[PDB]
Design an enzyme around this catalytic site. Structure first.
Site, short mmCIF file in Angstrom:
data_model
loop_
_atom_site.label_atom_id
_atom_site.label_comp_id
_atom_site.label_asym_id
_atom_site.label_seq_id
_atom_site.Cartn_x
_atom_site.Cartn_y
_atom_site.Cartn_z
CG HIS A 12 -1.78 -1.27 1.24
ND1 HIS A 12 -2.83 -1.59 0.21
CD2 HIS A 12 -1.88 -2.42 1.96
CE1 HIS A 12 -3.55 -2.60 0.51
NE2 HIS A 12 -2.88 -3.03 1.59
CE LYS A 38 13.37 31.08 -18.15
NZ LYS A 38 12.19 30.88 -16.68
CE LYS A 63 3.10 35.65 -11.71
NZ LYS A 63 1.83 35.80 -11.25
NE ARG A 82 9.03 26.22 -6.95
CZ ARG A 82 8.49 27.42 -7.44
NH1 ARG A 82 9.20 28.34 -6.77
NH2 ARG A 82 7.38 27.51 -8.28
CG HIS A 116 5.07 34.95 -20.49
ND1 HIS A 116 6.27 34.80 -19.90
CD2 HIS A 116 4.06 35.49 -19.52
CE1 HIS A 116 6.09 35.26 -18.60
NE2 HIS A 116 4.88 35.63 -18.45
CG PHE A 117 4.06 28.84 -17.66
CD1 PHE A 117 4.04 29.17 -16.35
CD2 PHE A 117 3.37 27.82 -18.07
CE1 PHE A 117 3.50 28.44 -15.24
CE2 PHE A 117 2.61 26.94 -17.17
CZ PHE A 117 2.46 27.43 -15.76
#
Ligand code: CGP
Lengths: 121, 124
Positions: A12, A38, A63, A82, A116-117
């Site tokens: 499990h 990046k 933004k 990240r 663009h993200f």
């Protein structure tokens, strides 16, 4: 013989944060570690057509104040990359996180497609 | 340098293939965890939280187990899980599963010293 505890674990347990090397390889192969690391990058796993379709979905503010951003109506499968605290060019290193979130992209051109993200929400 | 559209694809697109979709997770997992060796296990849940968080359930909400015993416990909060259930065309030894992700409370049976989970009873 297998203990009852170990049998429960084999049957499990599948820990997601334990489950990756995906970001290190992808950030490298997409050339996002070429001249610097990046810092953050999101990869989207839905079809190209489904992402392109976001350009005619919910119109929202970018933004930077521009108004050519669009948010997907549905959450989409993505992976966030990240840098780790130790990451240091030319040895870039990333923490991999899968999520299902709304994406927001800036669209432009003919065809009117993503360029663009902007964020995930 | 590419067009801005091509740069978005390169930076942000990694479309999954049919083979890498989560729809196939159970078919893989039920086999790699040896749950299809003697027969197709009908139903089996995988929990995606840390082992520490699942083990901690043994000290959370005490509840009756499905079988009548009372060493079962429900997590106070939902957990990220995957239910694996045989499809209608699953036939040993070619077991086939429906993969269903969910955020649900889980209930496990605990036993031993240390007192840890030994059986998955149900998700609710
Ligand atoms: N929703 C459900 C219902 C049953 N199961 C399994 C878990 C039990 O496995 P064990 O932990 O081996 O005991 C089995 C028999 O009740 O069914 C499940 O994993 N998810």
């Amino acid at each position: 013989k297998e203990t009852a505890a170990a049998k429960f674990e084999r049957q499990h347990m599948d820990s997601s944060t334990s489950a990756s090397n995906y970001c290190n390889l992808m950030m490298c192969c997409r050339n996002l570690t070429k001249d610097r690391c990046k810092p953050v990058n999101t990869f989207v796993h839905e079809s190209l057509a489904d992402v392109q379709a976001v350009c005619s979905q919910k119109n929202v503010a970018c933004k930077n104040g521009q108004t050519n951003c669009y948010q997907s109506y549905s959450t989409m499968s993505i992976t966030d990359c990240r840098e780790t605290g130790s990451s240091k060019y030319p040895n870039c290193a990333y923490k991999t996180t899968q999520a299902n979130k709304h994406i927001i992209v800036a669209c432009e051109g003919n065809p009117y497609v993503p360029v663009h993200f902007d964020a995930s929400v």
